[PDB]
Every structure is written in C-alpha cells, then in structure tokens.
Design a protein around this ligand. Structure first.
Ligand code: GDP
Ligand code: MG
Length: 171
C-alpha cells in the first residue's frame, strides 16, 4: 500500500542495472545495454511493511524523458553507486550527490552510498575510504555484489529505512 520511489545513479559500468535486476528478478545479468533507462516495480516486505518499490535505473542519456524528470524530482531516495574496482566511479560520486541536493533543494535527501562489485579482487577503493566519504555526507554506506546478491537487499531496504526517517521528520 505504501510506495517508495527510488533512483539508482552512478557512473557508467558500476552495476546500476545489474543491482536493480538482481533486486527485482533475483538474477545477475551478464550484459544490459548501458543506454537503457527504465523503471522497475516489485511488491516487497521490509521490516514487516508491505510496499511497492518503484525504482528508476538511470543511464544518463541526454534525450528527454518525462519519466526521468518525474523520478528525480519526486524520487524519495537515491542509491549513489560506484564500483570498488573503479577509482574514477568513486571520484564521480560527489557530482551525483551534488546534483541530487540541487533537485531536492536540500542537504538532507534520503540516500545511500553503494560500493558494488565487492566479489572482485581488483579493489582500488578501500572500505575506510568509502566509509569516510559516507561519514561526510551523513549517509549509510553498503558494499554490494549484484553477482552474488551480497548486500543488494540491504542497500535498497536501508534506503527505504532512510526515507521513513525523513518522512517522519517532515511531519
Ligand atoms: N563481478 C561483478 N560484475 C558486475 C557487478 N555488477 C555489475 N557487474 C557487471 O558490470 C558490467 C556493467 O554492469 P551494468 O549493470 O550494465 O552497469 P551500469 O552501466 O551501471 O548500469 C556488466 O558486465 C555486469 O555483468 C558485480 O557486483 N560484480
Ligand atoms: Mg545500465
């Protein structure tokens, strides 16, 4: 009955699509056209509450989408995703958070920092690094693998729990 509008953002290749599809369909996609942006819905139970997750997997294509606009402005929570084997994608995080702050005109937007691909040994971004950045933003940090499903539910559900904290402060 309660809906949650989630948006997944981050540099190309970090695993935004694989994480979303893992969440909704419980499998790991080998390849997914990096230009495809679409929303995915799933009814789930989180801490005993039935809700519908309405999740926008962004792809960053300059072509107009009225759905995208709607989601960024009405998006209640955002997953900011980098890959632990992609130093540049971690450097790109701040750009994403800053543009979310602008859309919401707020420094307190429900948001979670996600370090994806944590099954890979070629790690270049250590946990303390990402934990210190999330400390600065005042948001949770979760390490995930869309391949093995580690942390995937935790990432999306933690975001819902952040939206709940926000919603109950604002009223
Ligand atoms: N090993 C590993 N590969 C991943 C993971 N998540 C995504 N990938 C792969 O990384 C590539 C890009 O993922 P994709 O979801 O298209 O990233 P996007 O551009 O952010 O949407 C694909 O080849 C996926 O199979 C992960 O957690 N572990
Ligand atoms: Mg994609």
């Amino acid at each position: 009955m309660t809906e949650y509008k989630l948006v997944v953002v981050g540099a190309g290749g970090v695993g935004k699509s694989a994480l979303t599809i893992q969440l909704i369909q419980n499998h790991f996609v080998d390849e997914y056209d990096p230009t495809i942006e679409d929303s995915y819905r799933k009814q789930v139970v989180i801490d005993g509450e039935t809700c519908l997750l309405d999740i926008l997997d962004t792809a960053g294509q300059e072509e107009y989408s009225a759905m995208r606009d709607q989601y960024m402005r009405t998006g209640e929570g955002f997953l900011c995703v980098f890959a632990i084997n992609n130093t540049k994608s971690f450097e790109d995080i701040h750009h994403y958070r800053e543009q979310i702050k602008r859309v919401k005109d707020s420094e307190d937007v429900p948001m979670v920092l996600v370090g994806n691909k944590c099954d890979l040994p070629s790690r270049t971004v250590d946990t303390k690094q990402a934990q210190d950045l999330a400390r600065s933003y005042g948001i949770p940090f979760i390490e995930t693998s869309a391949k093995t499903r580690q942390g995937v539910d935790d990432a999306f559900y933690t975001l819902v729990r952040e939206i709940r904290k926000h919603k109950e402060k604002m009223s």
